[PDB]
Amino acid sequence: KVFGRCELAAAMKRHGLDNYRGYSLGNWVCAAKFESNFNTQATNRNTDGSTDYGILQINSRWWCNDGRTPGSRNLCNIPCSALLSSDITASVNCAKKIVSDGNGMNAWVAWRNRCKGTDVQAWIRGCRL
Ligand SMILES: [Cl-]
Ligand SMILES: [Cl-]
Ligand SMILES: [Cl-]
Ligand SMILES: [Cl-]
Ligand SMILES: [Cl-]
Ligand SMILES: [Cl-]
Ligand SMILES: [Cl-]
Ligand SMILES: [Cl-]
Ligand SMILES: [Cl-]
Ligand SMILES: [Cl-]
Ligand SMILES: [Cl-]
Ligand SMILES: [Cl-]
Ligand SMILES: [Cl-]
Ligand SMILES: [Cl-]
Ligand SMILES: [Cl-]
Ligand SMILES: [Cl-]
Ligand SMILES: [Cl-]
Ligand code: NA
Ligand SMILES: [Pt+2]
Ligand SMILES: [Pt+2]
């Protein structure tokens, strides 16, 4: 599914992400924009052989199982395919664990390079929330 901007803001708020770990909704929407362009089915192979999945490009090295990432873990206890569903619950649940891991949203390199410190409220501007 390709979400619209305000549509994803609303879904993320219903699933408890707004202000989670102190990160406002616009930070989450901005991270999803640059990680996946709001497409739940986005997948991208990393240099190391791991793969990033879903709207928040969650990596199989640590977080999910795809069966083809040696030596990796599965800390969200999910198949990585769950992260490609039109229902964002598994991506949000797993993102909550990632953003609690110590480095906040810096775990998403596109957030650090494209969102951090910018006017992220623009991402929710206009949305009936
Ligand atoms: Cl947009
Ligand atoms: Cl919703
Ligand atoms: Cl929804
Ligand atoms: Cl709904
Ligand atoms: Cl915001
Ligand atoms: Cl990498
Ligand atoms: Cl694996
Ligand atoms: Cl398995
Ligand atoms: Cl594990
Ligand atoms: Cl499975
Ligand atoms: Cl599995
Ligand atoms: Cl599996
Ligand atoms: Cl399994
Ligand atoms: Cl399985
Ligand atoms: Cl949803
Ligand atoms: Cl939903
Ligand atoms: Cl933080
Ligand atoms: Na894994
Ligand atoms: Pt909804
Ligand atoms: Pt499995």
PDB file of C-alpha atoms and ligand atoms in Angstrom:
ATOM      1  CA  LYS A   1       0.000   0.000   0.000  1.00  0.00           C
ATOM      2  CA  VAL A   2       1.192   3.545  -0.788  1.00  0.00           C
ATOM      3  CA  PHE A   3      -0.139   5.805   2.022  1.00  0.00           C
ATOM      4  CA  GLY A   4      -0.948   9.389   1.648  1.00  0.00           C
ATOM      5  CA  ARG A   5       0.896  11.780   3.966  1.00  0.00           C
ATOM      6  CA  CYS A   6      -1.988  12.592   6.329  1.00  0.00           C
ATOM      7  CA  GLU A   7      -3.323   9.079   6.024  1.00  0.00           C
ATOM      8  CA  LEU A   8      -0.077   7.695   7.410  1.00  0.00           C
ATOM      9  CA  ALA A   9       0.056  10.358  10.117  1.00  0.00           C
ATOM     10  CA  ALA A  10      -3.400   9.227  11.261  1.00  0.00           C
ATOM     11  CA  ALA A  11      -2.441   5.487  11.214  1.00  0.00           C
ATOM     12  CA  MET A  12       0.778   6.141  13.153  1.00  0.00           C
ATOM     13  CA  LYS A  13      -1.200   8.143  15.766  1.00  0.00           C
ATOM     14  CA  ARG A  14      -3.802   5.386  16.150  1.00  0.00           C
ATOM     15  CA  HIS A  15      -0.942   2.910  16.755  1.00  0.00           C
ATOM     16  CA  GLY A  16       0.667   5.082  19.450  1.00  0.00           C
ATOM     17  CA  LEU A  17       3.689   6.522  17.661  1.00  0.00           C
ATOM     18  CA  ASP A  18       2.947  10.152  18.099  1.00  0.00           C
ATOM     19  CA  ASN A  19       5.386  11.400  20.748  1.00  0.00           C
ATOM     20  CA  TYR A  20       6.684   7.907  21.313  1.00  0.00           C
ATOM     21  CA  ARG A  21      10.123   8.204  23.019  1.00  0.00           C
ATOM     22  CA  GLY A  22       9.583  11.992  22.682  1.00  0.00           C
ATOM     23  CA  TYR A  23       9.488  11.992  18.862  1.00  0.00           C
ATOM     24  CA  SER A  24       6.592  13.957  17.494  1.00  0.00           C
ATOM     25  CA  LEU A  25       4.402  12.590  14.699  1.00  0.00           C
ATOM     26  CA  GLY A  26       6.160  14.687  12.076  1.00  0.00           C
ATOM     27  CA  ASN A  27       9.487  12.996  12.790  1.00  0.00           C
ATOM     28  CA  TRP A  28       7.908   9.620  12.116  1.00  0.00           C
ATOM     29  CA  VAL A  29       6.151  10.762   8.943  1.00  0.00           C
ATOM     30  CA  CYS A  30       9.348  12.411   7.669  1.00  0.00           C
ATOM     31  CA  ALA A  31      11.373   9.202   8.362  1.00  0.00           C
ATOM     32  CA  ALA A  32       8.743   7.122   6.470  1.00  0.00           C
ATOM     33  CA  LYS A  33       8.807   9.592   3.539  1.00  0.00           C
ATOM     34  CA  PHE A  34      12.575   9.298   3.047  1.00  0.00           C
ATOM     35  CA  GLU A  35      12.896   5.589   3.941  1.00  0.00           C
ATOM     36  CA  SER A  36      10.069   4.285   1.731  1.00  0.00           C
ATOM     37  CA  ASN A  37       8.157   7.166   0.076  1.00  0.00           C
ATOM     38  CA  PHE A  38       5.235   5.848   2.146  1.00  0.00           C
ATOM     39  CA  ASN A  39       5.177   2.475   0.349  1.00  0.00           C
ATOM     40  CA  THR A  40       4.638  -0.456   2.718  1.00  0.00           C
ATOM     41  CA  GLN A  41       6.109  -2.957   0.179  1.00  0.00           C
ATOM     42  CA  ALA A  42       9.478  -1.163  -0.186  1.00  0.00           C
ATOM     43  CA  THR A  43      12.495  -3.510   0.141  1.00  0.00           C
ATOM     44  CA  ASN A  44      16.160  -2.690  -0.291  1.00  0.00           C
ATOM     45  CA  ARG A  45      19.242  -4.974  -0.097  1.00  0.00           C
ATOM     46  CA  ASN A  46      22.190  -3.716   1.941  1.00  0.00           C
ATOM     47  CA  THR A  47      25.882  -4.196   1.090  1.00  0.00           C
ATOM     48  CA  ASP A  48      26.254  -6.713   3.921  1.00  0.00           C
ATOM     49  CA  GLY A  49      23.533  -9.019   2.503  1.00  0.00           C
ATOM     50  CA  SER A  50      20.842  -7.880   5.022  1.00  0.00           C
ATOM     51  CA  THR A  51      17.591  -6.319   3.649  1.00  0.00           C
ATOM     52  CA  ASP A  52      15.455  -3.343   4.834  1.00  0.00           C
ATOM     53  CA  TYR A  53      11.673  -3.805   4.807  1.00  0.00           C
ATOM     54  CA  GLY A  54       8.536  -1.702   4.857  1.00  0.00           C
ATOM     55  CA  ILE A  55       7.582   1.886   5.497  1.00  0.00           C
ATOM     56  CA  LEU A  56      10.405   2.381   7.978  1.00  0.00           C
ATOM     57  CA  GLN A  57      13.003   0.182   6.173  1.00  0.00           C
ATOM     58  CA  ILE A  58      13.595  -2.095   9.213  1.00  0.00           C
ATOM     59  CA  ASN A  59      16.749  -4.169   8.782  1.00  0.00           C
ATOM     60  CA  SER A  60      16.956  -8.001   8.895  1.00  0.00           C
ATOM     61  CA  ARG A  61      20.493  -7.843  10.531  1.00  0.00           C
ATOM     62  CA  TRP A  62      18.791  -7.211  13.922  1.00  0.00           C
ATOM     63  CA  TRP A  63      15.110  -6.876  13.832  1.00  0.00           C
ATOM     64  CA  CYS A  64      13.243  -9.374  11.748  1.00  0.00           C
ATOM     65  CA  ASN A  65      13.756 -12.829  10.182  1.00  0.00           C
ATOM     66  CA  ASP A  66      14.028 -13.210   6.410  1.00  0.00           C
ATOM     67  CA  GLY A  67      16.027 -16.552   6.466  1.00  0.00           C
ATOM     68  CA  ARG A  68      18.866 -15.177   4.340  1.00  0.00           C
ATOM     69  CA  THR A  69      20.809 -12.906   6.637  1.00  0.00           C
ATOM     70  CA  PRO A  70      23.528 -14.978   8.311  1.00  0.00           C
ATOM     71  CA  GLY A  71      24.330 -14.378  11.890  1.00  0.00           C
ATOM     72  CA  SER A  72      21.519 -11.964  12.208  1.00  0.00           C
ATOM     73  CA  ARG A  73      18.958 -11.696  14.925  1.00  0.00           C
ATOM     74  CA  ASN A  74      15.161 -11.258  15.032  1.00  0.00           C
ATOM     75  CA  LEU A  75      14.545  -8.943  18.000  1.00  0.00           C
ATOM     76  CA  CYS A  76      11.047  -7.961  16.936  1.00  0.00           C
ATOM     77  CA  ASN A  77      10.125 -11.701  16.650  1.00  0.00           C
ATOM     78  CA  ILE A  78       8.508 -11.367  13.241  1.00  0.00           C
ATOM     79  CA  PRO A  79       9.114 -12.515   9.700  1.00  0.00           C
ATOM     80  CA  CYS A  80      10.337  -9.533   7.722  1.00  0.00           C
ATOM     81  CA  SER A  81       7.354 -10.034   5.340  1.00  0.00           C
ATOM     82  CA  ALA A  82       5.109  -8.775   8.186  1.00  0.00           C
ATOM     83  CA  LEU A  83       6.737  -5.427   7.752  1.00  0.00           C
ATOM     84  CA  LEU A  84       5.332  -5.155   4.154  1.00  0.00           C
ATOM     85  CA  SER A  85       1.629  -5.448   5.109  1.00  0.00           C
ATOM     86  CA  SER A  86      -0.926  -2.762   4.338  1.00  0.00           C
ATOM     87  CA  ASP A  87      -1.641  -2.814   8.101  1.00  0.00           C
ATOM     88  CA  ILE A  88       1.260  -0.948   9.736  1.00  0.00           C
ATOM     89  CA  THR A  89       0.895  -2.557  13.226  1.00  0.00           C
ATOM     90  CA  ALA A  90       3.972  -4.817  12.918  1.00  0.00           C
ATOM     91  CA  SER A  91       6.188  -2.005  11.531  1.00  0.00           C
ATOM     92  CA  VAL A  92       5.059   0.313  14.373  1.00  0.00           C
ATOM     93  CA  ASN A  93       5.528  -2.284  17.094  1.00  0.00           C
ATOM     94  CA  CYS A  94       9.001  -3.047  15.838  1.00  0.00           C
ATOM     95  CA  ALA A  95       9.908   0.663  15.346  1.00  0.00           C
ATOM     96  CA  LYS A  96       9.009   1.256  19.020  1.00  0.00           C
ATOM     97  CA  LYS A  97      11.630  -1.358  20.002  1.00  0.00           C
ATOM     98  CA  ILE A  98      14.228   0.151  17.609  1.00  0.00           C
ATOM     99  CA  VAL A  99      13.777   3.746  18.865  1.00  0.00           C
ATOM    100  CA  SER A 100      14.078   2.493  22.463  1.00  0.00           C
ATOM    101  CA  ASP A 101      17.473   0.783  21.707  1.00  0.00           C
ATOM    102  CA  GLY A 102      19.689   3.697  22.809  1.00  0.00           C
ATOM    103  CA  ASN A 103      20.209   6.005  19.821  1.00  0.00           C
ATOM    104  CA  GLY A 104      16.630   7.220  19.333  1.00  0.00           C
ATOM    105  CA  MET A 105      15.702   7.950  15.729  1.00  0.00           C
ATOM    106  CA  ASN A 106      19.357   8.017  14.685  1.00  0.00           C
ATOM    107  CA  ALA A 107      18.865   4.299  14.001  1.00  0.00           C
ATOM    108  CA  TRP A 108      17.236   5.490  10.737  1.00  0.00           C
ATOM    109  CA  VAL A 109      20.024   6.988   8.706  1.00  0.00           C
ATOM    110  CA  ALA A 110      17.566   8.813   6.342  1.00  0.00           C
ATOM    111  CA  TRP A 111      15.954  10.431   9.484  1.00  0.00           C
ATOM    112  CA  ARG A 112      19.305  11.620  10.758  1.00  0.00           C
ATOM    113  CA  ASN A 113      20.397  12.967   7.307  1.00  0.00           C
ATOM    114  CA  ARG A 114      17.073  14.366   6.053  1.00  0.00           C
ATOM    115  CA  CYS A 115      14.735  15.008   9.041  1.00  0.00           C
ATOM    116  CA  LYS A 116      16.701  15.673  12.187  1.00  0.00           C
ATOM    117  CA  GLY A 117      16.599  19.356  13.107  1.00  0.00           C
ATOM    118  CA  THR A 118      14.353  20.352  10.154  1.00  0.00           C
ATOM    119  CA  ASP A 119      10.797  21.671  10.409  1.00  0.00           C
ATOM    120  CA  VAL A 120       9.229  18.223  10.734  1.00  0.00           C
ATOM    121  CA  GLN A 121       5.817  19.694  11.726  1.00  0.00           C
ATOM    122  CA  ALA A 122       5.384  20.460   8.002  1.00  0.00           C
ATOM    123  CA  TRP A 123       4.832  16.708   7.479  1.00  0.00           C
ATOM    124  CA  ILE A 124       1.597  16.782   9.505  1.00  0.00           C
ATOM    125  CA  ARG A 125       0.501  20.305   8.401  1.00  0.00           C
ATOM    126  CA  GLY A 126      -3.090  20.352   7.306  1.00  0.00           C
ATOM    127  CA  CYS A 127      -3.961  16.852   8.576  1.00  0.00           C
ATOM    128  CA  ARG A 128      -7.127  16.321  10.518  1.00  0.00           C
ATOM    129  CA  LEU A 129      -5.442  14.600  13.487  1.00  0.00           C
TER     130      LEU A 129
HETATM  131 CL    CL B   1       4.391  13.816   0.604  1.00  0.00          CL
HETATM  132 CL    CL B   2      -5.921   5.321  12.011  1.00  0.00          CL
HETATM  133 CL    CL B   3      -5.799   2.681   9.852  1.00  0.00          CL
HETATM  134 CL    CL B   4      -8.757   3.674  11.313  1.00  0.00          CL
HETATM  135 CL    CL B   5       5.554  17.264  14.358  1.00  0.00          CL
HETATM  136 CL    CL B   6      24.355  -0.374   5.441  1.00  0.00          CL
HETATM  137 CL    CL B   7      18.552 -15.269   8.578  1.00  0.00          CL
HETATM  138 CL    CL B   8      11.319 -19.144  10.313  1.00  0.00          CL
HETATM  139 CL    CL B   9      16.642 -12.960  18.050  1.00  0.00          CL
HETATM  140 CL    CL B  10       7.089 -16.909   9.553  1.00  0.00          CL
HETATM  141 CL    CL B  11       9.966 -16.109  10.981  1.00  0.00          CL
HETATM  142 CL    CL B  12       9.995 -17.197   8.066  1.00  0.00          CL
HETATM  143 CL    CL B  13       8.467 -18.897  11.946  1.00  0.00          CL
HETATM  144 CL    CL B  14       8.332 -19.845   8.891  1.00  0.00          CL
HETATM  145 CL    CL B  15      -2.675   0.599   9.385  1.00  0.00          CL
HETATM  146 CL    CL B  16      -4.612   0.331  10.250  1.00  0.00          CL
HETATM  147 CL    CL B  17      16.177  10.380  21.982  1.00  0.00          CL
HETATM  148 NA    NA B  18      17.388 -11.433  11.003  1.00  0.00          NA
HETATM  149 PT    PT B  19      -7.101   4.711   9.960  1.00  0.00          PT
HETATM  150 PT    PT B  20       9.152 -18.004  10.037  1.00  0.00          PT
END
